[PDB]
Design a protein around this ligand. Sequence first.
Ligand SMILES: Nc1nc2c(ncn2[C@@H]2O[C@H](COP(=O)(O)OP(=O)(O)NP(=O)(O)O)[C@@H](O)[C@H]2O)c(=O)[nH]1
Ligand SMILES: Nc1nc2c(ncn2[C@@H]2O[C@H](COP(=O)(O)OP(=O)(O)NP(=O)(O)O)[C@@H](O)[C@H]2O)c(=O)[nH]1
Ligand code: SF4
Ligand code: SF4
Ligand SMILES: [Mg+2]
Lengths: 71, 595, 182, 263, 61, 118
Amino acid sequence: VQLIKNGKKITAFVPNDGCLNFIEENDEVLVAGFGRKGHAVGDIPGVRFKVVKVANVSLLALYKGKKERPR
Amino acid sequence: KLTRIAIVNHDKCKPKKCRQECKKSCPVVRMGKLCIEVTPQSKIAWISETLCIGCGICIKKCPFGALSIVNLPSNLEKETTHRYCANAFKLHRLPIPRPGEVLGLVGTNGIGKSTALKILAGKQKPNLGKYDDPPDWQEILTYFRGSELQNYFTKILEDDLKAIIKPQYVDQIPKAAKGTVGSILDRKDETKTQAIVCQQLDLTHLKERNVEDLSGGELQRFACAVVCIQKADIFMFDEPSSYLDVKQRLKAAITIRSLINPDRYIIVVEHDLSVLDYLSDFICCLYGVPSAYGVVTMPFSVREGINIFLDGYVPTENLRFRDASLVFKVAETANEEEVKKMCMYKYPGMKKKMGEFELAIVAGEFTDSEIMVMLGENGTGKTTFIRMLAGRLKPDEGGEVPVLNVSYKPQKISPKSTGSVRQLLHEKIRDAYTHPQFVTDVMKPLQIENIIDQEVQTLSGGELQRVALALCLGKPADVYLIDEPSAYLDSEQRLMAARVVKRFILHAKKTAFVVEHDFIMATYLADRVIVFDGIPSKNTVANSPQTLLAGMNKFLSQLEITFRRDPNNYRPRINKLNSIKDVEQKKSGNYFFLD
Amino acid sequence: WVCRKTYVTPRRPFEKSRLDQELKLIGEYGLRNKREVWRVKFTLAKIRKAARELLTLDEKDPRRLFEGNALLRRLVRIGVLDEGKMKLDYILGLKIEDFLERRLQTQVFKLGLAKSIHHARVLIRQRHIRVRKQVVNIPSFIVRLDSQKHIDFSLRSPYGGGRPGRVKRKNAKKGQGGAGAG
Amino acid sequence: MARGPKKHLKRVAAPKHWMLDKLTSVFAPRPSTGPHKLRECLPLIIFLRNKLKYALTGDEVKKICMQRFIKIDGKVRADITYPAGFMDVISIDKTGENFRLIYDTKGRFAVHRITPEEAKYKLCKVRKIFVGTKGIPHLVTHDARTIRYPDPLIKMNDTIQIDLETGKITDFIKFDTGNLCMVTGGANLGRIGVITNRERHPGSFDVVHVKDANGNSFATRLSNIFVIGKGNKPWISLPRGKGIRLTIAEERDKRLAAKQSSG
Amino acid sequence: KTTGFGMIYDSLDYAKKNEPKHRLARHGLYEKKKTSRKQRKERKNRMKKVRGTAKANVGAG
Amino acid sequence: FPMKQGVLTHGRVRLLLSKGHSCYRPRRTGERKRKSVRGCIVDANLSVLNLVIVKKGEKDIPGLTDTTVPRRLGPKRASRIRKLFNLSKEDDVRQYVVRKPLNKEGKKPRTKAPKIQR
RNA sequence: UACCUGGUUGAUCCUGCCAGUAGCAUAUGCUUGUCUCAAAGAUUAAGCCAUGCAUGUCUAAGUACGCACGGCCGGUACAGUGAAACUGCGAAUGGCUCAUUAAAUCAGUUAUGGUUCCUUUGGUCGCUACUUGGAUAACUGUGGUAAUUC
RNA sequence: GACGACCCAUUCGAACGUCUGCCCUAUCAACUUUCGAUGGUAGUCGCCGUGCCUACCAUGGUGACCACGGGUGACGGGGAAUCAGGGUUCGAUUCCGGAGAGGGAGCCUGAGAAACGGCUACCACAUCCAAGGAAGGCAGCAGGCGCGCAAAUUACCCACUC
RNA sequence: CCUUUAACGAGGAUCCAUUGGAGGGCAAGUCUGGUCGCAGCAGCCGCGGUAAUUCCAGCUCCAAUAGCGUAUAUUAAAGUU
Ligand SMILES: Nc1nc2c(ncn2[C@@H]2O[C@H](COP(=O)(O)OP(=O)(O)NP(=O)(O)O)[C@@H](O)[C@H]2O)c(=O)[nH]1
Ligand SMILES: Nc1nc2c(ncn2[C@@H]2O[C@H](COP(=O)(O)OP(=O)(O)NP(=O)(O)O)[C@@H](O)[C@H]2O)c(=O)[nH]1
Ligand code: SF4
Ligand code: SF4
Ligand SMILES: [Mg+2]
């Protein structure tokens, strides 16, 4: 991902199974840290950030099926 | 929610001293698709419209502040004051009916202006999304709580503000109602103000005359008169200035201007040139897509709003696309092949009469493969003459029969043909000069497909005028009779269509008698001009046909009114009745500058 | 304006020993949540802190006298402490359960007309009791000592004099429109 | 903010001896300029609806004062605010009432009703002696009266009885040890007791010991002392309380003894 | 129980003079007009921009 | 652009103006604006001029000097009445005031007078 | 409540950090019956702004010949009511923002015997005259400018 | 009774001045001076005291007890969160003091302003125009655009409080 | 709005409580089906290579509750300033 307000690049994890498909290339996303506040978490190296919302819609409601893609 | 896009040209936007960071740090131009196209070169940076996701990253780290960020118009289920149902028009905002000034309401055709007036009037109440299981004088007041329209709508309820509107159309009425001469308007109401209205309406003629003998002028006059004399609180004028003389239009705007000042609310529409300067004091512009969605922008000052509406796209404050030169024809072009051969006809100086009219024609040259323009004042005898030449009544002595079949353009258009427009298009033919033609009037930007289907009963003014424009180059005929095509069209739609009509009838070899009241409509469409001179309900002389310039000078010498050329954009601007320069032009007799 | 919390959370999140005490205490008195427990224990531990000051102050300091005298009066006025005690050492012998005896729902059950404690809370909320002349709806009244001899049912209720409920008068109208005309 | 003088005083900026609440709005009355200082004033309207409760809104006081039932220091005043302070007399002649502004032992302006005969004069401290033009003297007082030709032995920190009718003082007290004094400012306020001793320091902020008839000794600055009459013999009437300055424990004992909160 | 606050005047004219207007109009003998709010301010600013004659704006808008 | 005195050659000049000068209206006390004005010296660049008749000729111009309109108002002050009708110091002015008719009112005509001062 | 627990080894005891735990305040996800109290474009851009409004003011008592209303007839200070206009006073108070600012700001403490002070309150008020001088507005009437509280 | 005026006192203040109290940094250790730095003498100016300014004359003043310089997502205080004892962290923000109204400078009026709901000019912006000219400053209440992870009604009203 | 009062207004199927978790730290499954080092979970230690108490689901159970989860600043824990 590239950022809006810096233009620099960050590599961000995507959570649960099949949530990759609900992210489509060249759209906006919202990122957030893992919960270790600077350091790479778990067995995955080089990643320090994860993803929470695709476009005013949560990964949860996309995954669970109580909402649908707005497009 | 909305649209976002980048824009690029600026004072020393210098792709030859910035290394081009816009190309280097754009996310789109990295994933393969070239959104931003640039090199070390002598021109400007090029940036696409369609491929820009929005972002604004290029803007924040371009080394010169050359690239700005626009936001293009789109619907996002926002506000939504009403809809009819689905796959149908919707409107978002109906805004402040500021009192003590007149509110001028200025957008393209089929955009919901009339619909906003219907809602403001309390007659077609707003539905606001849905479907509309809430009304009733509660839920909508709760929805537009915290604002103003609570105080307005509660005052309406209670009919403290009494509603009146001037209707969009003439036709259904002189057909739906009827009118007793004299007695009618009389036991309308009441005194001094009707005398001021009818006298400042500059008529003095139709005091003793039955309605059925009158035309556009008389109609409009009486209408406005009664409307004003109508003792009420609110007041709405839709489209008050259609098919009326240029002199008479100015005196309509000032009789509307009488009602304004002492805690009264007033809404006007219009599709203007530069007369809106005297119509309104607040100008409120509407944007969107014709017959799909309309959005009302917050109101502006008349001077500031006028240009920003015709400028080509003023936002700040939002933003859009399109809009530009249209107050003329700036269609720089001319010349042909060898024009061979032609003729010299010539129609004779007939004398014609009805009852309260002495109408006279002078002999003139009606050239082959060539336009003829009629004016001249309302009541100056133009339309009924053409019918009398073709076949209806006349002549007592002499006449010339049309050599070519004949195409009839009408002005009194309110036709009744039940079924569909597509059925009527079969009484013409859609195979002939099959390569575009109707498609070259309109197809790609404002849509037609848009002109078929649907009913003619529910069709709006400019589209209904376009039905009539098609009915003329659509039976096989080559000599064309057209009265008032400028009726219910704006500037954007009229000028291009008029240029297309001239191109058709001149290029494949024809002749057309055009009866325009529009500087831009008349000019770019003119040649001979023929000039009609004389006083309404007395005497009509068609002046022996002379020069565009000389004939236009005869019309404006008697009227006492003139124009100015907008110097950057070549656009007409009317003068304020009596000014300073309004004296150099009177002396130089010259009412047009820059051929 | 001015706001503050009336309870605190436990430092440990879980602890087998703690949870059983909080559970079984809630069972006896019919309390809704632990927030109704920790509320009590905040007030108590506050009073246990104030007392813990005055014992370390000099004997016959004027601050120590005036505070203690008027404090112990308040503890006696609600009846969590006796006047056969009447000194600051017995503040530290005071504990959580003695408060809960003076709760309204506890006193309804213990000294009045109720079934199980779960019943008695419902009677307080459905407006069938009063305290001297005044309806209440709060089971956390904590009841002053003097007002224990004025706990009575309400004077407009189907329990004692006053209009019946809509279950009875419904069935009365079943004798007239349910089997009398329907 | 400031570029010139201010014209507002809020609720919470205002002093605490007017006993203001906090659930009426942001502003408080603010006394307009006059002879007394705003940390020693009782504004007029605070006497009429936050003490005696004749009026209920400020608009009512505007309708009252115009009728000219109000006097202050035997003259007629006719405004919402006036800065009356310690030792002035209010006089409503319609009700036949007369008040005096004096300090409780709490240290706040009480209701001290008095005979109309007492309300024909007030007690005024001398603060400055100033020789005017052509060999004429002057006095200066805390109520800002300039009384010419005083007796030539009256000096500052004395007090003088002034007849409101004619000015021109009739009599006086001389500042001496063992005379009876009242306090007008500082931490000790409203206490009554005899002078007992004085203490001088060349420089400023000389202090003045005091002792009462309850066997307590305390001291205060010189410029917060006001004389009321000779030893154990005030030349004014005194309210209840009488400068005893009870502890909080004893005040508790009185209330539960009489059992007094009902009549 | 319910608790309120009551006045009793000696004569009518002492009430009619003193009395805040809305309490007199509470059981009618007075009204208000005047007329809503706003129509005042927009007139005021228009009156401001004339001099000598403002009688049009006071009646006339 | 208006013409004022003391503004030699006829260019268009922006002068500081304040109270007690031509072509200024204060909207606040002490206020000073810098408006444009135009010189004294006459040219054909002017819209209109104001000529005051000073000396009257032999002839009478038909539209102006033949027409006769009386001035409206007498004095309001004491001493102007004394100077006008040439009264002595002792005569006690009380009936030497101009009486200004109210022509109609649908009731009756009034005759108004002003109020004497000093 | 002045409290700790998991993780380096085959196992043990240390050193040491990481993780677990509780509070607070901002954002955000999901959910939501009833009752009271109420913070809210500061964080970033002290970025830029359409429209509307936010400061005016007359008593018995400065100045009333508005051809206004009214009058009981007037003007002889002369009416009652009174738009407008001159005059006096206020507009330096409030509201808002936190950019600047490290002995500066600011707080406590002190000083005018180094000074100024509308206003209020109290004192100060004797080395043609039965009332002096001449212009400006409103008002009346004629105008200029595309346009202005010109 | 009403108004006005001269001076003194008073009230509300205003303005300078005393003593003590301050976050990070030495990969900032010497700093300040005829472009007055410190002091003396006289004068000008100012509401007054004063190198505030000018003439003449002297050569001082400050620092390892941290000056000088740089940094601060630093307005200050009354306070807030956590807390056994000792502390740590925060304080744009309802009270008080201060500074500023796009960026700079100058000035009128008044008792009080170097005022921006006053004015003049330059600079950066932006508006109308018949191209001759004219008009503007929402860090006031609402409202819009932009910016961002991030924040409300172009509502009702002077009855309360002032 | 609140309080006060007419008249309607509860048989559990609806006048419907959710948010996280159940290998250890840490309160609660060596239950059933699917997947087979794949997909995923996992602050940490570690789970998945065909018999998974940790994954995807079902059932049951646990915690707090009109609230609960997640990210970040910061204090306590830290006698690791
Ligand atoms: N189906 C349907 N469409 C309607 C109806 N009324 C209006 N419309 C459509 O709504 C759109 C706008 O209508 P209107 O407000 O009249 O347009 P306008 O802006 O006034 N048009 P114009 O500028 O030409 O004067 C058009 O596409 C029109 O066909 C109706 O009753 N039914
Ligand atoms: N007296 C009379 N007038 C009639 C009769 N029929 C029509 N007229 C009027 O006579 C006039 C003839 O001019 P016309 O060609 O209609 O004018 P126009 O082309 O419509 N001009 P405009 O559109 O500007 O109004 C019109 O005003 C028409 O209404 C009749 O029988 N008697
Ligand atoms: S826009 Fe900014 S960046 Fe893109 S070219 Fe012009 S200057 Fe270089
Ligand atoms: S705007 Fe968003 S998309 Fe269009 S150019 Fe700049 S960055 Fe690329
Ligand atoms: Mg239409």
